[PDB]
Amino acid sequence: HWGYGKHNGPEHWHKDFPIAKGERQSPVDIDTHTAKYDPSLKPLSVSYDQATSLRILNNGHAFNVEFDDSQDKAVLKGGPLDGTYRLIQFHFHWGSLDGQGSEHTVDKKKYAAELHLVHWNTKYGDFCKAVQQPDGLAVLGIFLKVGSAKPGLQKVVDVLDSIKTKGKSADFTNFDPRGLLPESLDYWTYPGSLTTPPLLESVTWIVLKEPISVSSEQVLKFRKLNFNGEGEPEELMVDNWRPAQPLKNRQIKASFK
Numbered sequence: 001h002w003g004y005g006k007h008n009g010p011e012h013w014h015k016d017f018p019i020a021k022g023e024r025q026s027p028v029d030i031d032t033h034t035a036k037y038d039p040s041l042k043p044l045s046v047s048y049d050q051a052t053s054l055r056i057l058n059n060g061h062a063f064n065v066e067f068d069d070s071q072d073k074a075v076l077k078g079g080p081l082d083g084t085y086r087l088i089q090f091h092f093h094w095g096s097l098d099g100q101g102s103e104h105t106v107d108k109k110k111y112a113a114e115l116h117l118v119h120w121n122t123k124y125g126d127f128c129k130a131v132q133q134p135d136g137l138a139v140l141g142i143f144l145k146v147g148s149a150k151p152g153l154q155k156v157v158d159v160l161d162s163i164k165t166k167g168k169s170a171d172f173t174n175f176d177p178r179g180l181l182p183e184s185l186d187y188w189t190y191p192g193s194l195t196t197p198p199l200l201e202s203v204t205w206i207v208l209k210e211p212i213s214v215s216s217e218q219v220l221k222f223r224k225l226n227f228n229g230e231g232e233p234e235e236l237m238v239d240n241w242r243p244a245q246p247l248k249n250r251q252i253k254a255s256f257k
């Protein structure tokens with residue numbers, strides 16, 4: 001029953017998920033002047049050449065593009081990470097207006113949307129075990145600004161009509177997530193959590209400094225999705241983002257000088 005409305009939104013989540021008020025919750029504001037360059041960080045390696053997309057699903061909170069994670073086909077390594085993290089899915093969070101929609105903020109700036117590429121640590125064997133571990137997941141976060149169109153997003157945009165309502169899925173094979181990345185892999189990193197219930201404190205966040213540009217027409221099509229199921233009253237899928245949470249006893253590290 002959790003969601004993003006007045007009556008089931010982020011201010012209510014703590015009543016069923018008490019970890020909502022925990023010590024390593026996400027997202028956070030990234031204060032760029034306070035974040036410190038870390039020389040101990042190794043080079044970040046995004047290896048998506050053999051990625052195998054399968055399906056796209058409207059789950060009632062966002063849409064997920066799902067991948068075959070039964071082998072090391074699309075992996076994230078290096079940076080703050082020990083070992084190999086396998087891509088399982090990506091999704092977005094976005095706003096009702098271009099001035100909001102991101103989960104992380106940068107010096108309090110909100111972007112129009114945020115892309116999350118979700119990976120699990122292969123030392124734990126599957127996602128279900130990994131999500132219960134403090135180093136179980138790595139989420140690569142990428143900001144979206146409204147400007148020129150992102151060509152590699154268009155195949156996602158054009159399938160959204162077929163998954164308008166909660167519980168609808170469609171085939172989504174042969175999609176290359178490399179087309180969603182910016183040029184630079186400069187990043188900030190900190191230990192955090194899932195940004196939706198169950199809000200588990202199992203995520204190493206890696207947030208790219210360079211946003212990608214998407215067109216107004218592209219984000220407008222995100223906003224035509226529905227939170228509701230088929231034949232229920234229409235509630236547009238907009239503002240599916242959690243606001244920034246207290247940083248508490250954490251340091252945000254930068255990969256770049």
Ligand SMILES: Nc1ccc(/N=N/c2ccc(S(N)(=O)=O)cc2)cc1
Nearest residue numbers: 116118131139193194195196197198
């Ligand atoms: N049992 C269970 C149910 C739902 C789960 N959700 N996984 C999610 C995966 C990634 C995100 S996020 N927004 O990338 O932090 C948030 C949730 C995880 C485990």
Ligand SMILES: [Zn+2]
Nearest residue numbers: 091093116195
């Ligand atoms: Zn997310």
